[PDB]
Amino acid sequence: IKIATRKYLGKQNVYDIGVERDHNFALKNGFIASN
């Protein structure tokens, strides 16, 4: 799957969760996000 476009949003609250084994996890559509 390709990323078509990019746009700036300014600063906002962001977050991370942790995982101990393979440091990734799944999002809604099956995208695999780090951390």
Binding site: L9, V14, D16, E20
Partner: protein, 101 residues
């Protein structure tokens, strides 16, 4: 780092906004991908409110939006973890599981 509303797949509750997970310290189990592409499950072991940072909105081919910080690594089709901005700049393809649960 990811924006509040970005949804994470949980076994127990389904999709939850990472913001809600973090700010309520929600203990839950998520799905991860293997060194070799096997899906498995594991618990969230840490919770981070990172506060405010610079966020971009990356619109995907399928209509999906990811709102993150540039540096936030995602899995490519080749299995590498690369910052989403570099994935965007290099026109690389995101891995998408499709068969999570």
């Amino acid at each position: 780092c990811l924006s509040y509303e970005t949804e994470i797949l949980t076994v127990e509750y389904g999709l939850l906004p990472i913001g809600k997970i973090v700010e309520k310290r929600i203990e839950c189990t998520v799905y991860s991908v293997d060194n070799n592409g096997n899906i498995y499950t594991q618990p969230v072991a840490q919770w981070h409110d990172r506060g405010e940072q610079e966020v971009f909105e990356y619109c995907l081919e399928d209509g999906s939006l990811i709102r993150a910080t540039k540096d936030h690594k995602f899995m490519t089709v080749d299995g590498q973890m690369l910052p989403i901005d570099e994935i965007f700049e290099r026109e690389l393809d995101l891995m998408r599981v499709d068969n999570l649960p």
